Subunit: 494 residues, 4 copies
C-alpha cells in the first residue's frame, strides 16, 4: 500500500536553520550532496562552520532563557507541538520518503513504510512523555520537605549519521523537545536534505524561534564546534566508535558537557540447532542486509550450530543470490546503492580483506552496477573469530557465517568483542533463550526476531558501542537535569 | 542444619495487646487453642470482642495523631525499627518455629527453614521501603507547583488466617509499618500464640505504644467489629471468599474504609507433554500437598496432557504414597495434621464427595492416625471439570488430576473458574510458556516451578480470589493515601 | 474569543449505545430530559434498565476476549484512537458546548472555555499514557526470572454525575481506554445528551464495537444493575456519599468487583490574615459559586481569620451581590440555573435551615427568576461548626463564612468533618502554607488558589469523600490488574 | 552523648586491599600521612601505582564474572551484607571517629555525631535499594514481549577526596554494591587510614574477594591509572573541577567508560530582608565554616539584602570571633586545623588576595596557632562579584559577604558563575522561596537551612560543579547498565 513516488522531488531547503529562518553560511560556502544511485549531484547545500554553530548556539541559549515562550510553555503544550509536527510530517510523507531515497539510496518502499512510519511513531510516543516525567517528593530525615525538579538540561548539541536521516533526527528531537530543551543539530553531509525540510515543518508546527536550529556541514568543522562549544550543555552523538572518542575528549576539554553516544557494533546472531530453519534464514538475511547493511546493530556475526550449518549456509547463499539490487525507486528493488563513494570503496576493501584472510567467498564479492555505488550481496562462510571481517564493522552487504558447537562456547565467542550494541538468539527452547539473553553482553537481545525497534523500548550499547540509552522512558534521563529543593518546615509528619 | 526443637515450648503471651501492654478481655472470657497433633489444649487465650476492638482502635488513633512520636519519626527510622524486629525474631527463631508447629501442626523443619525464613525476608524487605516510596512533583498547566504527598492511610484493620500465622502477620505488618500506618490486628483463633509473642518483640524493638495492637478472638465478634468500625480507615483481610464478601459489605455499610482481599482459589497446574517428567511430578506434588494442602494458591487442579497422563499419574501416586505423615516435630515427617476438627471434617467430606461423583481414588482417602487431625495423602484421577472436587477449594491433602489434549482446550478449562489466584505451566517450549502465561487469568503464573514467593514480587488474585496485591512495591499502594498540593507561583518555567 | 452559540442545538442521539449501534430500551420506555433554564422538556431518552445493562455487559465482555481487535491492538494505537476522539470532539466543540449548556444550565462561555478545554486535555493526556504504564522485572531470590504484566482489569462499570457531564465522561474513558479496558457507562438522567453524542464520535474515531457502551436511565435501575452485575470486573462511581455506600455494598454482595468512589465534600477554604485580600476574596467567591455551586470540592466552609473577617465579609457580599444570574447563553451570565427541580427545592431548604439556626443572612436567600431553577447568590455570615449548613453538602450558590483565631484552631475545625475531598490555604507565609497543607486531611490542598485541576495531578477524597484517585498516573492504578510471572531459569545472575 | 575518644588511636591497616588481602605496593614504596593538628607523621601507607591498580582491576573483573558468588548472590543478600557492614562500622564507631579526626583534623564530636552517623545512614539506606531497582515490561508494538534488565555497569573505579573520608567512601560503595558492581577505589593520600580500616570490615562482613578493592596512593599515578584503564567500565570522581576535566578526557581517550563527577562550587547563600535574623546568622555561619570550610557546597557567597546588611554583618563577625579553634579532640573545639600544609598555604594566599583587591577584612585573616594547620575564622565584608575571593573556591574558613538590593539582582549575581553545586534562600515569604528555588541554577537549593543532606535526596552539580547525581534513587542510575530483551511471541494481547 504505497503511493507512486516522485522520482525527482524538488528541493526547497538547503540552508542553515536558525531562529526559524534560513541562512547562508557566514563564509557563503556550499557543498554538493550526491544521489548514490546515479553518482550525480542533486544540489548544493550551505556549509556550516564554527561561526555558524556559534550563531545557532546563541539562538538556542536565547530561547532557553527563564521566562521565554519555550520555558513558560505548559509541558502538555510541548506535547501538542510534537503531535502537530508529526501530523505535518505525515501530510508530507510521500514527498519525504522520496527525498529520503534520492539522497540516501534506500528503497522508496522502505523509506515510506519503515523509516517514515517509525519517525511518526517516535514523535507521537515522545509527545506523550512531555508532561509525565515526574520529579519526586522525598521522605528525608528531619523537619524538612524535600523534592526534586526535573528541569531541561539546556542547550543540546545533537549530531546524527546518514544511515537513517529522518529517523535519527526524530530519535534526537523527540526526547529533547518533550523535556523542554533547545537544540543545535548537525546533520550528515551525505544526507542533509530531509532534515532541512523537516525544519520547515518545525516552524510550521509553531515551535518558538531558536528551539531547534539545524546546521548542515562536515564533522571536523561543524560537528567539532558543537562538541567543543563552551555554551552547549549536553551533546548526543550517533556515528562511528572512532569519532565517539573524539566527541568525549572534546567534551572533557571544554565545559564538561553531558555526553551520550550511540556507536557501531559487530552484533552476534546466534542460531541454535532447534530454531525454525526457514524463519532463522530469513531473519538472519534481514539482520545483516537491511538498509544496504548500513545499520549499527547489523547481525554481522551469524553463529550457526554445527548440526544445521550446511543447510543454513546453503539457504542463506540462495537468499543472498535472489536479493534484487537496483533502482531504489523501483518496487522490485530490495537493495539500493551504498551511501557514497567513500563507503563504497571501504566495503570493497573489506571484501578483499576477507578473501585474503581465507574466508570462503560463497557468493557476490564485487560491484553490482557500473553507475552508482552498488555492491553485490556478499556471503562469507567458515569465518573465524580472529579474522578482520569477524571483528570490524563493515557497514555493507557482507555477511559472515561462523560455526559453533556448544551454548557455553558461543556465549564466550559472542561476548569476545569490544562491541556490545545488539545480539540475537534463535531457539525454541525456553531455557536456552533465558540462558543466552542473560549471558550476552549487549544493549538489545532479540529472541527469535531481529531489528525490532519500538519507541517505547530503550536502545544503546554496552562497552564501546556507546553509553546511555535512546528511546523509551530511558531516553529522557540524558535530557534532564535534577534539582533538589530542601525546605525547612515547622514539624515534619508522615 | 535445623537446631533441635523444644517439642513443648512454654507460652508467655496469651492476652490482648494494646499500647504495648497485655490486657484480659473486658468480659474476662478466654478460649482454648488446641494442639492439632494431639487434640489437647495448649492454653487459654483472651477472647477479644467489640469493646476490646474499640480500645485498640482508640489506642491506634492516638498513636496516629499529628505530632506523635510515630508520625514525627523519620521514615528511615521506621526501617531501623523493622530491621530490629527481624533481628529479634531471628534471635528467637527456634522458639517461634516450635510454637508455630505446636499451635498450627506444620512440620518443625518447615516452620524453621520456610515460614520463619520468609518472615525475616519479608520484614527486612519492607524495612528498606520505609523511606523510598516517593510522591511526585507534577508539571501541571499554568503558573502552579503541583506535587503529591504519600501519606499513611491511617488506622489499619488486619485480619489474618491460620495456615501461615507468622508469615501472614509479616505480610501485613511489613507494608503497613513501612509506610507509617498504625495497626489493629485480629489473628486466627486456631493459631493466636505466635503472633502474640511477636507483639512482645514489637515492644522490645521499641515501636511506640498503640502502633501495633493485636486482638485475639473470633471472626463474627472481633473481626466483624474491625470491619464495621467507624474509625478504621482501611481493612485488609485474608481468608475465605465467603467471608471476603462479608468484609466488603461491612466496609460499605460503615464508613467506606478502603478494602483489599486475599481469598481462596482452585489454581490450575498445567503439565504439557514436553515437560520434564521428574521435575513436573515432584513440583505437582509440592504444589498441592504443601503445608497439609492448606495453601490458598495450591495447585488443586493438575491438568496433564494425554500422552504423558498415565506415566504422570503412576509417579504421582507413588510419590503421594511415600509421603510421610506423623509427628510434626519428627524430622522424618513431611506432613503434619490439619489445623482443627472443623477443617478435618470438611476434608473428609470432600473426599467422600469425590468418591460419590465418580473420581478415581488412586490412594489415601481416609484418616491417617487414631489421634490428631491426620489425613492420608489422597489422589483422585480422571477428575472432570463438573465434579465438586474440581470446583471447590478443599484446603487439604487431596490431589485432583485432570486430562486434556490441546493447549487451546486447557486455557479455556483453566480459566473456567470464579477463582484466579495462581496457576502454573510446565513445558520446555518458549512459545507455549509465553502463550500460557499471557492467557491464564491468574494473579501469579509460575513457569516450570510452583509456590515460588519472593518479598519482591506481588501476590494477589484475579476475579473472586481477591483484589489488590501484597508483597513487592505494589504492597505499599493499599497503605498509602495520596494528597495533591497545588501551589500558585509567580511564574512557572520548565 | 468564543464562537457564537446555537441557542437551540439539534439532538442527534437519545438512545442506548451498544456495539457502536443505537438501540431503544428493551421495554421501549423513554424518559424526558429537561432544560433547567426554561423548565421545558428537550427530548425523550431511552430508559435503560437491567436487561439493557446485561446486553451492554455481554458486548463489552465479547470485545474484551483474548485475540479480539481491542485486545490485540498495539498500546500505541489505543493512544492514536484517544487522540482521534479528542480531535473529533474539538471539531464539534461549539456544538457540544451549546448542548452541554442546554441540558445542564451552566454558562455557554464556561462550557466552551472550561469544560470542553478540560475534556480535550484529559483525553489527550491519557492518550500519551496508553503505551507507557510499564510493568516490572523483579530481582527475586533464587534461580528465577520474575516480572509483572500490567493487564486491563476488564469490564468496567462507570457511573457519572450531572454537574460536569462531558468532563466526568472524559475522566472515566481516558484512563479506562488508555489501559485497554472495555466500558459500560451509565450517565445521569438529568444530563444524558452530550455523552450520547460523544458515543457517536467514539464510533467515528474507530474504536471496536463493544469497547464503549452507554446506557442512559435511572440510578436504582441501570446504576444498580451495573454495581451488582456478576460479569462486571470493576466499578467507578462518582456522586453522593449516600449512593457510594450502596455501590460498595452491591460490589461486596455480588462478584467482589474492584471499587473506586468519588463522593462529595464540605471543603474548608482557610483565609489567613496575611493573605492578599483582593485575591482571596475573588478566589473564595469562585471556590464556592463555580458551576452554580454544583462542584464536589466547593469551598463551602470559608474560614477567615478574625483580624480581616469584617473586610473580607464586606467584599464577599459585594461580590455575591454583583454576580450576574440569567440565561446561560448570554455572554454576561456568570450563573445559570440549578440542574433540576429536586436540587432547586433542596437548596432552598438549606437556605431556610440556615436562617432557622441563627446564621446571619447577608445577601440573596431566594428565587432569582419566575422561570427556570434560578437561585440568588446567597451568603451566610457568623456560621458555626454545629450548624447544618456548616456540615451538609448544599451543592448550590450558598456561601458559609466562619471566623477563627489561631492556626492550630482552624486545623482542628477544618479536619472535624466526615468529608475530606479538598481544602485551601491563603497566606503569604511559607511556614503557614507548609504547616497547613500537611495537617489538612484532604485529597487536594490548594495554596493561594482554588479549583486548579490538571489532568496530570490526581484528584480523590479522604475519609468518606471517596477512595482511589482519578487523573495523573494514579488514575491508571484502578484500571490495571497485576499479574506476576515467575519463571525458573538455569542460573540467575545480576 | 559522645564516648571518650582515644586521642592517639592505633593504626591496623596501611596497605593495598585486593581480594580481601593486604598487599604492599609492587614497588614496595610507602608515603607518610600527617596529623594536621600537629604536623607529625601518623604512619606510612603503601604507595599504589599503575601496577597495583592493574592487580585490583583484575581481581574486580574476576569477581564480576558470570556465575561468580557475587553475580549469583540474591539481590536481597547484597542488602544483608551492606547492613552487616553498617553494623560493624557502628560497633567500631568510637574508634573510627577518633581515627577520622586524627587523619583529617575535624572535631571528634563532629566525626562521631555527624560523619559516622551519616555513614551508617548512607549504607543502611542503600542496603534497602539492593532488591528494589526494577527493570520494566514494555508494551511495544507488534507480537513481541519486550522488557529491560537492570544489570550492573561492571568494574567501577571510584576516586574520593579528603574532606569527608568515611562519608565519601560510603556515598560511593552504597549505590555500587547495592546494584551488584565491583569496585577499585582510590582514597585521598591525605586521609587513607579510615577507608582502609573499613576495608577490613568489608572482609569481616562476608563480601566475596575482589568485590571491593582499595588502592591508596597519589592521583597522577593511581588515580590516572584508574581513569585510563582499558578494563574499568565506569568512573566516579569527586574533587576539584580541574582534575575532573582530566578524568573525562582520560575516559574518552581510553575505553569510553561511563563517567560522573562531583566537583567544586562557589555556592550563594541568599539572605532576604524578611528572613529570621538569628536563624540566618547562625545558618550562614554553619554554611561556610562547617568542616573547616572544607565542603564542596560551602556557602562561600553570602548575599545580604541592604536593609539588614549592617546588622547581619555585625552579628556574623561576633559569631566568627567566638568560634573556638583548637585541638579537635577537645570537646570545646568548633574548628580543627586544615587538612594539610598545601591547603593551609593556599587559604592564606586567598586571604592575602582578598586584602589586596579591596575586600574589607572584618575579623581573623591569619594563622591561629604556631603548630598544626590552624587558621582563624575570617570574614570579608563589601565583597564584589569581580573579586577573586568571590569567584574562586577557597575551601577554608574565609567568609565573603556581599550586599544586594533586589530579588532579580541576587538571582542574576548568584547564577553568574561557572559553578552550580548548591544554593540557599532565607526568607519567610512563600512566593520569594518558590521564585528563587526555581530560578537558581544549582543542584541543590536549601530554603531556610543549609548543608541538609539526606541519603534519600540526590546531590550533584549543574554546569562545571559536576555531572550526574549521588544519593537517593538517582544514585543508582550511574551504576546500572540497561539491557532490552525483545522476544517474539505467538500473539500479543494487552
Ligand atoms: Na545475520
Ligand atoms: Na491450634
Ligand atoms: Na489443597
Ligand atoms: Na437536563
Amino acid at each position: 500500500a504505497v503511493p507512486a513516488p516522485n522520482q525527482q522531488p524538488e528541493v526547497f531547503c538547503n540552508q542553515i536553520f536558525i531562529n526559524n529562518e534560513w541562512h547562508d553560511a557566514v563564509s557563503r560556502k556550499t557543498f554538493p550532496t550526491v544521489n548514490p544511485s546515479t553518482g550525480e549531484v542533486i544540489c548544493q547545500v550551505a556549509e556550516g562552520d564554527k561561526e555558524d554553530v556559534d550563531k545557532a548556539v546563541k539562538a538556542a541559549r536565547a530561547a532557553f532563557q527563564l521566562g521565554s515562550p519555550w520555558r513558560r510553555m505548559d509541558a502538555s503544550h510541548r506535547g501538542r507541538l510534537l503531535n502537530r509536527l508529526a501530523d505535518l510530517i505525515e501530510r508530507d510523507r510521500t514527498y519525504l520518503a522520496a527525498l529520503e531515497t534520492l539522497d540516501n539510496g534506500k528503497p522508496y518502499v522502505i523509506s515510506y513504510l519503515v523509516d517514515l512510519d517509525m519517525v511518526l511513531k517516535c514523535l507521537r510516543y515522545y509527545a506523550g512523555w512531555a508532561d509525565k516525567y515526574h520529579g519526586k517528593t522525598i521522605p528525608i530525615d528531619g523537619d524538612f520537605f524535600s523534592y526534586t525538579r526535573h528541569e531541561p538540561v539546556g542547550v543540546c548539541g545533537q549530531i546524527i549519521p546518514w544511515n537513517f536521516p529522518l529517523l535519527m533526527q526524530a530519535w534526537k528531537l523527540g526526547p529533547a523537545l518533550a523535556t523542554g530543551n533547545v537544540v543545535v543539530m548537525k546533520v550528515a553531509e551525505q544526507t542533509p536534505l530531509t532534515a532541512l525540510y523537516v525544519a520547515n515543518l518545525i516552524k510550521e508546527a509553531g515551535f518558538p524561534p531558536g528551539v531547534v536550529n539545524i546546521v548542515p556541514g562536515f564533522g571536523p568543522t561543524a560537528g567539532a564546534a558543537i562538541a567543543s562549544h563552551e555554551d552547549v550543555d549536553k551533546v548526543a552523538f550517533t556515528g562511528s566508535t572512532e569519532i565517539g572518542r573524539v566527541i568525549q575528549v572534546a567534551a572533557g576539554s571544554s565545559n564538561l558537557k553531558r555526553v551520550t553516544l550511540e556507536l557501531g557494533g559487530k552484533s552476534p546472531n546466534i542460531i541454535m540447532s532447534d530454531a525454525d530453519m526457514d524463519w532463522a534464514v530469513e531473519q538472519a538475511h534481514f539482520a545483516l542486509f537491511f538498509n544496504q547493511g548500513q545499520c549499527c546493530c547489523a547481525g554481522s556475526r551469524t553463529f550457526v550450530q554445527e548440526d544445521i550449518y550446511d543447510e543454513f549456509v546453503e539457504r542463506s547463499v540462495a537468499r543472498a543470490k535472489s536479493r534484487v539490487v537496483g533502482n531504489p525507486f523501483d518496487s522490485k528493488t530490495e537493495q539500493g546503492p551504498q551511501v557514497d563513494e567513500t563507503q563504497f570503496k571501504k566495503i570493497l576493501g573489506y571484501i578483499n580483506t576477507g578473501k585474503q584472510e581465507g574466508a570462503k567467498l560463497l557468493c557476490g564479492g564485487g560491484i553490482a552496477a557500473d553507475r552508482g555505488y552498488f555492491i553485490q550481496p556478499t556471503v562469507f562462510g567458515d569465518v573465524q573469530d580472529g579474522m578482520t571481517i569477524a571483528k570490524e564493522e563493515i557497514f555493507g552487504p557482507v555477511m559472515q557465517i561462523l560455526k559453533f558447537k556448544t551454548i557455553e562456547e558461543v556465549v564466550g565467542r559472542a561476548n569476545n568483542s569490544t562491541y556490545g550494541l545488539a545480539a540475537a538468539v534463535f531457539t525454541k527452547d525456553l531455557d536456552k533463550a533465558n540462558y543466552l539473553s542473560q549471558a550476552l553482553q549487549a544493549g538489545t537481545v532479540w529472541v527469535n526476531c531481529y531489528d525490532v525497534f519500538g519507541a517505547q523500548s530503550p536502545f544503546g550499547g554496552y562497552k564501546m558501542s556507546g553509553s546511555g540509552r535512546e528511546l523509551g522512558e530511558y531516553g529522557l534521563q540524558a535530557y534532564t537535569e535534577v534539582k533538589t529543593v530542601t525546605v525547612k518546615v515547622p514539624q515534619k509528619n508522615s
